[PDB]
């Protein structure tokens, strides 16, 4: 009676870990994708900023 | 005394479950860490690229500006100077008290 | 310790310069400090009309 | 009967203690591993930052 | 009852401290690992920087000096008043 | 004993940085001869 | 005391350095103190233009 009752609790915990791993694993993959995406975004943003400075400097030199 | 008997059997089972919780924690916090690592690493890559690109742009501005200064140094110096000074003087609370004036108080809030 | 010593045992003066500057930034990081400088200072030597 | 009950509960506490002790130990070693992985990643970033500084 | 009651209490605390004791150790070990790792990175970053400075020490010192100053100066309140008047009150809180 | 100068400087700067960063500072010119504490 | 003595006896000057520095951190930890330094101080020797 009590033995079976506590056996069910142990089986449920094992399933949770497995499911938790899966969900956690997925989050890790997603995090890496977002990380590289942000890097490229910054790169493009910084690339344009360099072009802008050139233009700004040209105007100043002309002035 | 029968009540205590089943409690002890439940204790053994309770030991095994706590382990699973700790195990799950390890199998859940460790992947998280791996994700947090690729984030900071990607950020560093951006930093390197960012400073490099920013440096290039600034360099270019300096290069162009340089010959202009070499032509009329005094005129360029005066203009740039006044322009910079004007900005700071107009963003601060100036006093302009004569040299005579001595002791003061900062009054830092 | 060993690592740092070896790495910096080639140019000690440069290490002091960099490390000192880093300390300053982290020391005065908070905005609860005052710096009563003077205009005749060396750093502000370019605030005087050329 | 009262005396038998008291000794039976002591065995139950030991089990709980063990489990709690084991759980703490497991979490402790896991935290160490996580700290190591995060520290390693932070060391690689510094190298990358240094390259930019040197090039800049 | 009291004897058995206190006996259980003593028994209880004993493994409780063991876990705490082991945890404390683990924490110390983590610190050690981090320290060593942090050292390496700093050394590595420093190393690369060094040859660059060897080429232009004056320009490198200037740039880095202006950069640092600007940051600290930008945060802390400034005065820029004649040092001749060497009398002042701080009025702290 | 291997590198006393290098390790001594590091410790000094390290410790200093901590205390300096956790305490209020003035930095007023050494020439200054008057100052008011105004405590509680 | 016995333990501490023999250990530090080896290098008395070095023990003073670390111990003293430690005390500063443990003493000035709180944020209810002030440190009125100067720019002429040897710690801020690098705050002046190179």
């Amino acid at each position: 009676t009590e033995v079976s009752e506590a056996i069910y609790n142990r089986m449920r915990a094992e399933r949770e870990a497995v499911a938790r791993r899966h969900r956690s694993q997925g989050q890790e993959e997603a995090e890496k994708l977002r990380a590289t995406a942000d890097y490229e975004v910054t790169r493009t943003l910084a690339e344009a900023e360099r072009q802008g400075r050139i233009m700004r400097g040209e105007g100043d030199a002309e002035a | 005394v029968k009540a205590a008997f089943d409690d002890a059997i439940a204790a053994r089972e309770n030991e095994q479950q706590y382990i699973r919780e700790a195990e799950a924690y390890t199998n859940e916090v460790q992947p998280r860490a791996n994700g947090q690592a690729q984030r900071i690493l990607e950020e560093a890559r951006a930093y390197k690229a960012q400073t490099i690109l920013e440096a290039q742009g600034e360099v270019a501005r300096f290069a162009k500006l340089l010959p202009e200064y070499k032509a009329a140094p005094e005129i360029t110096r005066e203009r740039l100077y006044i322009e910079t000074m004007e900005k700071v003087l107009g963003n601060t609370r100036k006093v302009l008290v004569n040299d005579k004036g001595g002791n003061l108080m900062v009054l830092p809030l | 310790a060993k690592l740092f010593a070896d790495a910096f045992s080639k140019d000690p003066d440069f290490y002091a310069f960099i490390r000192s500057l880093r300390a300053y930034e982290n020391s005065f990081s908070g905005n609860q400090d005052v710096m009563v400088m003077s205009p005749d200072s060396d750093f502000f030597r370019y605030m005087k009309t050329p």
Side-chain angles (χ1 to χ4, degrees), chain A, chain B, chain C:
Chain A
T1 64
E2 311 322 318
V3 58
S4 61
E5 175 275 309
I7 285 280
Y8 204 75
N9 297 20
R10 195 276 314 287
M11 286 186 291
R12 294 284 212 205
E14 184 265 313
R15 293 286 89 183
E16 286 178 332
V18 173
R20 191 176 286 93
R21 183 173 174 181
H22 297 344
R23 281 167 179 175
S24 78
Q25 186 174 356
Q27 291 171 7
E28 169 171 355
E29 284 287 358
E31 199 73 1
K32 298 190 180 184
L33 297 168
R34 296 177 203 285
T36 178
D38 301 331
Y39 161 78
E40 281 287 0
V41 165
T42 313
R43 196 228 70 77
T44 55
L45 286 165
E47 189 68 24
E49 195 73 34
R50 174 256 183 172
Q51 293 163 71
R53 287 157 175 278
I54 291 159
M55 296 291 186
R56 291 174 181 282
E58 179 57 288
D60 300 2
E62 191 68 11
Chain B
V1 287
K2 272 58 173 174
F5 296 168
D6 51 291
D7 305 328
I9 316 307
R12 292 194 183 80
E13 196 271 338
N14 285 20
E15 169 168 358
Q16 309 310 307
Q17 74 182 353
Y18 302 153
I19 291 157
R20 304 302 105 74
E21 301 158 40
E23 284 174 359
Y25 187 77
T26 307
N27 299 292
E28 182 261 312
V29 180
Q30 173 50 227
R32 199 202 313 174
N34 292 270
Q36 294 181 27
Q38 189 61 231
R39 178 68 72 173
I40 59 178
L41 294 159
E42 283 290 355
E43 285 175 358
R45 296 186 177 79
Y47 191 87
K48 175 166 71 173
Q50 187 175 351
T51 185
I52 290 160
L53 296 169
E54 286 181 0
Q56 289 169 1
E58 190 174 3
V59 164
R61 299 189 70 183
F62 190 87
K64 297 192 176 185
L65 178 52
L66 161 59
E68 299 294 345
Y69 162 82
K70 298 283 277 289
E74 300 294 345
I75 307 305
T76 48
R77 275 170 163 278
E78 205 73 0
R79 185 174 63 77
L80 294 156
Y81 173 79
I82 292 155
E83 285 181 7
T84 293
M85 194 65 68
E86 172 171 348
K87 290 174 184 182
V88 58
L89 295 179
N91 301 332
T92 190
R93 297 180 179 178
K94 314 184 284 294
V95 172
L96 295 169
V97 160
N98 193 26
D99 66 79
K100 299 293 178 61
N103 198 355
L104 302 162
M105 41 186 84
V106 62
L107 274 63
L109 181 58
Chain C
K2 189 258 281 181
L3 299 171
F4 283 124
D6 189 10
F8 309 143
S9 51
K10 300 178 175 61
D11 204 24
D13 57 355
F14 180 81
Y15 157 67
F17 183 76
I18 302 301
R19 193 74 185 74
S20 178
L21 291 170
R22 182 171 177 178
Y24 298 166
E25 297 180 1
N26 296 331
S27 66
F28 296 93
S29 66
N31 319 123
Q32 304 85 3
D33 299 332
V34 176
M35 295 198 79
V36 180
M37 299 208 170
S38 60
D40 303 288
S41 301
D42 60 350
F43 175 78
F44 300 94
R45 68 188 187 285
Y46 281 105
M47 268 181 66
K48 298 164 202 310
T49 196

